[PDB]
Swiss-Prot record, chain C:
Domain of life: Eukaryota
Signal sequence annotation: none
Family the UniProt entry places it in: Belongs to the PI3/PI4-kinase family.
Clinical condition linked: Immunodeficiency 26 with or without neurologic abnormalities: A form of severe combined immunodeficiency characterized by reduced or absent T and B cells, recurrent candidiasis, and lower respiratory tract infections. Some patients show dysmorphic features, severe growth failure, microcephaly, seizures, and impaired neurological functions.
Species annotation: Homo sapiens
Quaternary structure, from the entry: DNA-PK is a heterotrimer of PRKDC and the Ku dimer (composed of XRCC6/Ku70 and XRCC5/Ku86). Formation of this complex may be promoted by interaction with ILF3. Component of the core long-range non-homologous end joining (NHEJ) complex (also named DNA-PK complex) composed of PRKDC, LIG4, XRCC4, XRCC6/Ku70, XRCC5/Ku86 and NHEJ1/XLF. Additional component of the NHEJ complex includes PAXX. Following autophosphorylation, PRKDC dissociates from DNA. Interacts with DNA-PKcs-interacting protein (KIP) with the region upstream the kinase domain.
Task of the protein: Serine/threonine-protein kinase that acts as a molecular sensor for DNA damage. Involved in DNA non-homologous end joining (NHEJ) required for double-strand break (DSB) repair and V(D)J recombination. Must be bound to DNA to express its catalytic properties. Promotes processing of hairpin DNA structures in V(D)J recombination by activation of the hairpin endonuclease artemis (DCLRE1C). Recruited by XRCC5 and XRCC6 to DNA ends and is required to (1) protect and align broken ends of DNA, thereby preventing their degradation, (2) and sequester the DSB for repair by NHEJ.
Localization per Swiss-Prot or TrEMBL: Nucleus; Nucleus, Nucleolus; Cytoplasm, Cytosol
Modified residues (N6-acetyllysine): K108
Identification of the protein by name: DNA-dependent protein kinase catalytic subunit
Full protein stretch here: 10 to 122 of 4128
UniProtKB/Swiss-Prot annotation, chain D:
Induction notes from the record: In osteoblasts, by FGF2.
Miscellaneous comment text of the record: Individuals with systemic lupus erythematosus (SLE) and related disorders produce extremely large amounts of autoantibodies to XRCC6 and XRCC5.
Family in the record: Belongs to the ku80 family.
Annotated localization: Nucleus; Nucleus, Nucleolus; Chromosome
Entry note about domains: The EEXXXDDL motif is required for the interaction with catalytic subunit PRKDC and its recruitment to sites of DNA damage. The VWFA domain interacts with the KBM (Ku-binding motif) found in a number of DNA repair proteins.
Gene: XRCC5
Protein name (database record): X-ray repair cross-complementing protein 5
Complex and partners: Heterodimer composed of XRCC5/Ku80 and XRCC6/Ku70; heterodimerization stabilizes XRCC5 protein. Component of the core long-range non-homologous end joining (NHEJ) complex (also named DNA-PK complex) composed of PRKDC, LIG4, XRCC4, XRCC6/Ku70, XRCC5/Ku86 and NHEJ1/XLF. Additional component of the NHEJ complex includes PAXX. Following autophosphorylation, PRKDC dissociates from DNA, leading to formation of the short-range NHEJ complex, composed of LIG4, XRCC4, XRCC6/Ku70, XRCC5/Ku86 and NHEJ1/XLF.
Function comment: Single-stranded DNA-dependent ATP-dependent helicase that plays a key role in DNA non-homologous end joining (NHEJ) by recruiting DNA-PK to DNA. Required for double-strand break repair and V(D)J recombination. Also has a role in chromosome translocation. The DNA helicase II complex binds preferentially to fork-like ends of double-stranded DNA in a cell cycle-dependent manner. It works in the 3'-5' direction. During NHEJ, the XRCC5-XRRC6 dimer performs the recognition step: it recognizes and binds to the broken ends of the DNA and protects them from further resection.
Highest taxon listed in the record's lineage: Eukaryota
Swiss-Prot record, chain E:
Outcome after substituting R164H: In a colorectal adenocarcinoma sample; somatic mutation
Record's subunit section: DNA-PK is a heterotrimer of PRKDC and the Ku dimer (composed of XRCC6/Ku70 and XRCC5/Ku86). Formation of this complex may be promoted by interaction with ILF3. Component of the core long-range non-homologous end joining (NHEJ) complex (also named DNA-PK complex) composed of PRKDC, LIG4, XRCC4, XRCC6/Ku70, XRCC5/Ku86 and NHEJ1/XLF. Additional component of the NHEJ complex includes PAXX. Following autophosphorylation, PRKDC dissociates from DNA. Interacts with DNA-PKcs-interacting protein (KIP) with the region upstream the kinase domain.
Region (Leucine-zipper): 506-541
Protein name: DNA-dependent protein kinase catalytic subunit
Entry GO MF terms: ATP binding; DNA-dependent protein kinase activity; double-stranded DNA binding; enzyme binding; histone H2AXS139 kinase activity; protein domain specific binding; protein kinase activity; protein serine kinase activity
Residues of the full protein shown: 973 to 2307 of 4128
Residue windows of the TPR repeats: 705-738
Keywords, sorted A to Z: Acetylation, ATP-binding, Biological rhythms, Cytoplasm, Disease variant, DNA damage, DNA recombination, DNA repair, DNA-binding, Immunity, Innate immunity, Kinase, Nucleotide-binding, Nucleus, Phosphoprotein, Repeat, Ribosome biogenesis, SCID, Serine/threonine-protein kinase, TPR repeat, Transferase, Ubl conjugation
Domain of life from the UniProt record: Eukaryota
Entry keyword annotation includes Transmembrane helix: no
Length: 271, 73, 113, 59, 1120
């Protein structure tokens, strides 16, 4: 992972890319069908655990101090680039295998992670990685209404309240991740104080109009909450919910020769 | 025709590299596959915007804009 | 649509007994091949039912050892092969039907030719 | 290094080994522009070894 | 104008600034600017979203006011409704209005405008106090509604600007000036600085605790701003003299609106109770600030004016803290009851009384601990210790955030402050009341491993944290004294038993719990040696002690850093029979010490010194007495040591330096070692007398007898050799030690390019720029002396350095040997080889720049070439190259006399210990240089024209001159009007790398230009051109069918470039397109020839004499 984060970041002799390696890990964590064959003549969960420990040690190790010379001036911009690289890799790799493997870390990992976020509540990488964390947590559905579970719920609800109250002070590439949180939360936790999330949800859709994936995931969260929570509390701000959805609605070789089509052998906003 | 020597030396392969030429062809082919893989994603991005009126910059706006510049938009 | 109108014309185009009928049929089949070989996400699904009707269409209509039918049938088969090569399992409802056709296709006059 | 090579060669394939003779000639001869005296020591030592080996059987 | 896009906003901001500039003139002055200004007021200042809109509206209205003042006279603003004062009044009113948006927008707008607003004097003279009081009340309201509100940041920035300008400019404020009266200070008079200063002081004691804290901090920093008294506590005493008791309610309006409302809240309102609590905390923090600033004594509030609200709060803690977490006994009133912020307020009260106790104990010495007796019980010692052991015992303390994470440090501070106080003993009793320090050790034996209880781990962590806090307080035996000795085996026995019986499973939670237990044991002294014994556990699962080390290697390294050499010495004595685990723990020591460099590595240096003395106590290794693995391990250990310590001590004779250095030599003397491993050990030689080099030779002799190709490529011995030689190369590149340079040159300079000399010369290229100039001079002198095949040494070595040596060391080294070369400049093979080297070094010498003897040297080389066995030709070439060099400067005219991740990676690497002819080349350069300095010329090209145009001249000379003119065609382009004449006849009947190579090269060079000249001026030129056409069309074929085609287009180009002097034989062409007329394809090439003929516009066929002119084309249809 140190070699992974060492490679610089692309901005809009051959230079190898960082982004490729995920495919490796894509098989690396999904190699049951190979180790069983090699065992002919569990362990992927062990690799999962080792990777989680490594990302923990990196998160605690890395320093993200910055200056105002508002003005985002990192003191270690190379460390910032390594951080964002590791964040993108971790949240593009994580939602593949079982978060059942992640179950031991659901409390301590989230706790130290919230601490790190509170250290500098302006680094969007924290936001993306915690969003994928909670996404996996609701994928395995750790939420039921145990002292560890209740402590988890308390941390989640207070963190959601504070992000929802301090999100109005944030800008693009950061507030986008904040609304990514505010949609990525499970229905169970936000069953208290749904009101605070309503303007956040409205802004999330009106900004996902400008960037489709945010609108898509906000939509998904919206039907999730509609399914799980009783309408009687969501009713009053339905007249608020609909107008922010007005967007997306008001706009408007290869011949008869037989090559066995090796081309076919190889393999938005309207959606 | 000043590149005649240049084209002579660039196409100077009287030593045998026909297998190497085939390998270079194939390898460059896969790199072109990678380039076009990037290309379909690049073209998926919205095409660049164009403007139909000139633009100057002062501190008190002028009304010296032609009829063309207003009817083209 | 173009696929549908071409299917209807070919279902007609074999009404007369002449090699010219087979020529026009195979030409229309070649155009259909080069057309529906590159759908986006949708025209393939229309082509599924079109292939159903036209498949069973020739299965029960052509049914003759005349070569004018033979070249059209072989081009149809080649197109179906290159289609199913990259088409997905969505064709599975037709497949067993096609199976019930294909052997019946082969064991019939196709066996004689 | 070729010293032990021809030492084991003569007793492993049992030939007059003019190739071994040429090997030792190359071993000794490349001393004209160098003053590496310990190399000369081991060179004359392998010379004695090959002399004894040649005395041994037939040559 | 504020949208998420490049082009739109990018064109919008010039528009908005342009219209802002326009809509303030006397013409665009009133009744249309009103809409623009009011909307710029209501755009971002009031909105729920778009921080971008907020900042944009802020600085655009800033620039609007700036430009309005710039281009409109002050009388015009004053008479018009559009005036700065109206804007200020609007801002004040908006901040006054009870909505978050208005206040935050007004504050941020002021923040933006402040940069230009501070530069105006009349406005601030008339308007500061109003802005001051407005911002005070707005920030108080921001406290009232929610602290998380973004308004608080804008307000604190605004008041930062206010204090910045008040300290920047105070003379006008210092004197009483009749400025506009704000809402504050209801009496109207000549406003002064001290007026509003004391007005703020009297208002201290507000429910907004941090608003009051900022107000009093600003007060304190403005005390020196007063025109009279400076800012000691003495002036505060002067204020206190008359107001000895009034401060009880004046400066502290709280405690229950004075005393009573605090008593009122007890029987009867929960929100009112929280208001009482926060106002009381404001008073308490004001007390804490006063007593921590040392601006007032504790007895001043403890015998002059006595706030009974303090004892009321103490009784309330006896009534509400840790026992009333749901109701304050008022019986008049979780989220439905909102116990969340109730517990938050309770925790805030707890922390506030924590700073109060700490400041009382610290800022007031034990002489004021009698005032600590005012509680008469200090019941807190019974409950706050629970705070230390269970946060859930202060109420709930749920949330687990930076407030409770910050609690432990102030808790330790209070523990120390009470430790210097007597009451600690009672607290110590309370401590022993709260825990026995051993009632938990049996309860942690419940097999907490995977599936098990979790509350057990919970209070294990709780007691671990409490004991860590106590250790930070400098107290460990107040709860657990010595059992039998200083060694507290109560923890170490549990450690060993648990770590052994965990598998005789695992968990990260129990792992960190065991780590906490390890550090708790480390708090107990003397356990180090017992732990050392435990690590030496031969109990096999692999051994168990090494397993325990593997589980917690980092913790053991941290513990053993404190121990200097005691355990180090014990391991050294126990190293005689233990090798693996001792090496592992030594490596852990080294890695942790090397990692520790933020403060210092001097701990690592001392550890290296101690192991240096201990070195001679493990003699079973590093000789023919230990396994090769042991020798490799000790080599790795000492390499780690060497890279850790500085190479100035124990690099020369320094105490224990020889005892290992000689050992090192003995280690090098061990011939049983692998030569690869020997090179690995050598790799550390950059850290460094005759014995060293002599053993170096005696080793390297047994490696490379005479050749590198005697060992086939891929042979394992061969790969060993290449690895060793690259080790030597890199080590020498790091060291630049001259003797190793000479050794490498002499082992390499045996055959040309057999030891992979590319890296050799390239490493020389780097090391030429490295090292001191004097070091480079000495190195060059050493290699020059060892010079005195034999020439192969200098040929492969010197020019590498010389071409890249520093141009200062060059001067020194050469000036050292000027006459040393002049004299030697004047069987015989030795002489010619030495002169070879001398020319090849003097040319590079001269290449740099220009005493007075040098004039002679020119002739001394010139004759060296002019003499008229191959070594003689090489000598002439070298002499002429040196002459070219010396011509490069003299005879410049004509007449030439014919990161954190990076740190982590480095630490990991450290722990892993793993990091066609050429003799004429200067001729072209000289031609280029002389062209740069400056048809016909006495530049010898007339001489060369005569030398080359004659048919009678040796072919090699013609090839040389042709290659030169090919590489130098550009210079004599405005002389090619003659150069076509020789080359043509040189190309004609031209006969060595291969004829066609130079043929195609020269024809391409000639035909690079066509308009410059054409071969038609003399019959000979065109007849020779036609002859060359015949030769090429006889020679034109290739099986490659590509270079063949390439020649086809070459012909196509050359025929169409002239079309004036060319002839078509039509006979050879006839037989080429006719051929034998077979079934196969052989004559089709001739067909393609006709394409060139019809690439031309020339007539299709001409009977030059007539082949047949009738069936001449019958062959065409026959071939068709």
């Amino acid at each position: 992972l140190i070699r992974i984060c060492s490679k610089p970041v692309v901005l809009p002799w051959k230079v190898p890319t960082y982004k490729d390696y995920v495919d490796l890990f894509r098989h690396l964590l999904s190699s049951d069908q190979m180790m069983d064959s090699i065992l002919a003549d569990s362990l992927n969960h062990l690799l999962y655990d080792e990777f989680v420990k490594s990302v923990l040690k990196i998160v605690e190790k890395l320093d993200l101090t910055l200056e105002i010379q508002a003005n985002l001036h990192p003191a270690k911009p190379k460390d910032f680039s390594a951080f964002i690289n590791l964040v993108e890799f971790c949240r593009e790799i994580l939602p593949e295998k079982q978060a059942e493997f992640f179950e031991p870390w659901v409390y301590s990992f989230s706790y130290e992670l919230i601490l790190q976020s509170t250290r500098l509540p302006l680094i969007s990488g924290f936001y993306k990685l915690l969003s994928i964390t909670v996404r996996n947590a609701k994928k395995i559905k750790y939420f039921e209404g145990d002292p560890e579970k209740y402590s988890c719920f308390a941390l989640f609800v207070k963190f959601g309240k504070e992000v929802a109250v301090k999100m109005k002070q944030y800008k693009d590439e950061l507030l986008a991740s904040c609304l990514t949180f505010l949609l990525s939360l499970p229905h169970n936790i936000i069953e208290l104080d749904v009101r605070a999330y309503v303007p956040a949800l409205q802004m999330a859709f009106k900004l996902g109009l400008s960037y489709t994936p945010l609108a898509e995931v906000g939509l998904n969260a919206l039907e999730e909450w509609s399914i799980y929570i009783d309408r009687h509390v969501m009713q009053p701000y339905y007249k608020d919910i609909l107008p922010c959805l007005d967007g997306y609605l008001k706009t408007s070789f290869n011949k008869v020769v037989l090559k066995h089509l090796k081309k076919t052998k190889n393999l938005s906003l309207e959606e | 025709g000043r590149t005649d020597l240049l084209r002579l030396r660039r196409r100077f392969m009287r030593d045998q590299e026909k297998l190497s030429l085939m390998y270079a062809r194939k390898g460059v082919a896969e790199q072109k596959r990678e380039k076009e893989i990037k290309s379909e994603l690049k073209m998926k991005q919205d095409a660049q915007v164009v403007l139909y009126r000139s633009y100057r910059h002062g501190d008190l706006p002028d009304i010296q804009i032609k009829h063309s510049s207003l009817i083209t938009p | 649509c173009s696929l549908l109108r071409l299917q209807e014309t070919l279902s007609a185009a074999d009404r007369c007994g002449a090699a010219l009928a087979g020529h026009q049929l195979i030409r229309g089949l070649g155009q259909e091949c080069v057309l529906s070989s590159s759908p986006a996400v949708l025209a393939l699904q229309t082509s599924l039912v079109f292939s159903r009707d036209f498949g069973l269409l020739v299965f029960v209509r052509k049914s003759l050892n005349s070569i004018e039918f033979r070249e059209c049938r072989e081009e149809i088969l080649k197109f179906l092969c290159i289609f199913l090569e990259k088409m997905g399992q969505k064709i599975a409802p037709y497949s067993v039907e096609i199976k019930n056709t294909c052997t019946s296709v082969y064991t019939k006059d196709r066996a004689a030719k | 290094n070729p010293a032990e090579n021809f030492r084991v060669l003569v007793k492993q394939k049992k030939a007059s080994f003019e190739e071994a003779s040429n090997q030792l000639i190359n071993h000794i001869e490349q001393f004209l522009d160098t003053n590496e005296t310990p190399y000369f020591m081991k060179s004359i030592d392998c010379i004695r070894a090959f002399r004894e080996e040649a005395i041994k059987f037939s040559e | 104008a504020c949208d998420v896009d490049q082009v739109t906003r990018q064109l919008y901001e010039p528009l908005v600034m342009q219209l802002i500039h326009w809509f303030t003139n006397n013409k665009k002055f009133e009744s249309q600017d009103t809409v623009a200004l009011l909307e710029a007021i209501l755009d971002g200042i009031v909105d729920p979203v778009d921080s971008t809109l907020r900042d944009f509206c802020g600085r655009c209205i800033r620039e609007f006011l700036k430009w309005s003042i710039k281009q409109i006279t002050p009388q015009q603003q004053e008479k018009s409704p559009v005036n700065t004062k109206s804007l200020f009044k609007r801002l004040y009113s908006l901040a006054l209005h009870p909505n978050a948006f208005k206040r935050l927008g007004a504050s941020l707008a002021f923040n933006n405008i402040y940069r230009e607003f501070r530069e105006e004097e009349s406005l601030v003279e008339q308007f500061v106090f109003e802005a001051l009081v407005i911002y005070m009340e707005s920030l108080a309201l921001a406290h009232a509604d929610e602290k998380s509100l973004g308004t608080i940041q804008q307000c604190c920035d605004a008041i930062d600007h206010l204090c910045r300008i008040i300290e920047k400019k105070h003379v006008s404020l210092n004197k009483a000036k009749k400025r506009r009266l704000p809402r504050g200070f209801p009496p109207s008079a000549s406003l002064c600085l001290l007026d509003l200063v004391k007005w703020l002081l009297a208002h201290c004691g507000r429910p907004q605790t941090e608003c009051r804290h900022k107000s009093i901090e600003l007060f304190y920093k403005f005390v020196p701003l007063l025109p009279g008294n400076r800012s000691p506590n003495l002036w505060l005493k002067d204020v206190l003299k008359e107001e000895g008791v009034s401060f009880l309610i004046n400066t502290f309006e709280g405690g229950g609106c004075g005393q009573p409302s605090g008593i009122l809240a007890q029987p009867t309102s929960l929100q009112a109770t929280l208001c009482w609590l926060d106002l009381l905390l404001a008073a308490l923090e004001c007390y804490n600030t006063f007593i921590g600033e040392r601006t007032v004594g504790a007895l001043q509030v403890l015998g002059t004016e006595a706030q009974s609200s303090l004892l009321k709060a103490v009784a309330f803690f006896l009534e509400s803290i840790a026992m009333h977490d749901i109701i304050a006994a008022e019986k008049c009133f979780t989220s439905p009851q909102e116990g969340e912020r109730y517990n938050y307020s309770k925790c805030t009260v707890v922390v506030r009384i924590m700073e109060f106790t700490t400041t009382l104990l610290n800022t007031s010495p034990e002489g004021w601990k009698l005032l600590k007796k005012d509680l008469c019980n200090t019941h807190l010692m019974r409950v706050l210790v629970q705070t230390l052991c269970e946060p859930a015992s202060i109420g709930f303390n749920i949330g687990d955030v930076q407030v409770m994470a910050h609690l432990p440090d102030v808790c330790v501070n209070l523990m120390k402050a009470l430790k210097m106080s007597p009451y600690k003993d009672i607290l110590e009793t309370h401590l022993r009341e709260k825990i026995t320090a051993q009632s938990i050790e049996e309860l942690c034996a419940v097999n907490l491993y995977g599936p098990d209880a979790q509350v057990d781990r919970s209070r294990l962590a709780a007691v671990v944290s409490a004991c860590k806090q106590l250790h930070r307080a400098g107290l460990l035996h107040n709860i657990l004294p010595s059992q039998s000795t200083d060694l507290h085996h109560s923890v170490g026995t549990e450690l060993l038993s648990l770590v052994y019986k965990g598998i005789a499973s695992l968990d990260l939670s129990c792992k960190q719990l065991a780590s906490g237990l390890l550090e708790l044991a480390f708090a107990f002294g003397g356990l180090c040696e017992r732990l050392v014994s435990l690590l030496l556990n031969p109990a096999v699962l692999f051994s168990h002690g090494e397993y325990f080390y593997s589980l917690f290697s980092e913790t053991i390294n941290t513990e053993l850093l404190k121990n200097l050499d005691l355990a180090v010495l014990e391991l050294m004595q126990s190293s005689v029979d233990n090798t693996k685990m001792v090496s592992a723990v030594l490596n852990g020591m080294l890695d942790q010490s090397f990692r520790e460099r933020a403060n210092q590595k001097h701990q690592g240096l001392k550890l290296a010194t101690t192991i240096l003395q201990h070195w001679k106590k493990c003699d079973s290794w590093w000789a023919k007495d230990s396994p090769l693995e042991t020798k490799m391990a000790v080599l790795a250990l000492l390499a780690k040591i060497l890279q850790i310590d500085s190479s100035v001590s124990f690099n020369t004779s320094h105490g224990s330096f020889p005892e290992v250095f000689t050992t090192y030599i003995s280690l090098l003397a061990d011939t049983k070692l692998d030569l690869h491993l020997k090179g690995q050990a050598v790799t550390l030689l950059p850290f460094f007398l005759e014995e060293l080099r002599r053993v170096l030779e005696q080793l390297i002799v047994a490696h490379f007898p005479m050749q590198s190709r005697e060992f086939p490529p891929g042979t394992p011995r061969f790969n060993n050799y290449v690895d060793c030689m690259k080790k030597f190369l890199d080590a020498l590149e790091l060291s630049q030690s001259p003797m190793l340079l000479e050794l490498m040159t002499e082992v390499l300079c045996r055959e040309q390019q057999h030891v992979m000399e590319e890296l050799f010369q390239s490493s020389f290229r780097r090391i030429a720029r490295r090292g001191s100039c004097v070091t480079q001079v000495g190195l060059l002198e050493s290699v020059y002396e060892m010079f005195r095949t034999r020439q192969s040494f200098v040929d492969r070595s010197l020019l590498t350095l010389l071409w890249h040596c520093s141009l200062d060391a060059l001067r020194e080294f050469f000036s050292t040997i000027v006459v040393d070369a002049i004299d030697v400049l004047k069987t015989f093979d030795t002489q010619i080889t030495k002169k070879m080297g001398y020319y090849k070094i003097l040319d590079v010498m001269y290449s740099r720049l220009p005493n007075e003897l040098t004039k002679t040297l020119i002739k001394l080389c010139y004759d060296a070439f002019t003499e008229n066995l191959e070594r003689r030709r090489l000598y002439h070439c070298a002499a002429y190259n040196c002459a070219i060099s010396v011509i490069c400067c003299v005879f410049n005219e004509l007449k030439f006399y014919q990161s954190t991740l990076s740190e982590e990676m480095s630490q990991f690497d450290f722990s892993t210990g793993v990091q066609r002819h050429e003799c004429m080349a200067p001729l072209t350069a000289l031609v280029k240089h002389m062209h740069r300095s400056l048809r016909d010329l006495p530049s010898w090209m007339k001489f060369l024209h005569g030398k080359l145009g004659n048919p009678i001249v040796p072919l090699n000379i013609r090839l040389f001159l042709a290659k030169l003119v090919i590489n130098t065609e550009e210079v004599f382009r405005p002389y090619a009007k003659h150069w076509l004449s020789p080359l043509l006849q040189l190309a004609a009947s031209e006969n060595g790398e291969g004829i066609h190579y130079m043929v195609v090269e020269i024809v391409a060079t000639i035909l690079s230009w066509t308009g410059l000249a054409t071969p038609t001026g003399v019959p000979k030129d065109e007849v020779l051109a036609n002859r060359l056409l015949n030769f090429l069309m006889k020679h034109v074929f290739h099986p490659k069918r590509a270079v063949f085609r390439h020649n086809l287009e070459i012909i196509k180009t050359l025929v169409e470039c002239w079309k004036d002097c060319l002839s078509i034989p039509y006979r050879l062409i006839f037989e080429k397109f006719s051929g034998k007329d077979p079934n196969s394809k052989d004559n089709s090439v001739g067909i393609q020839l006709l394409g060139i003929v019809m690439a031309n516009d020339l007539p299709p066929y001409d009977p030059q004499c007539g082949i047949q002119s009738s069936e001449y084309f019958q062959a065409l249809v026959n071939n068709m």
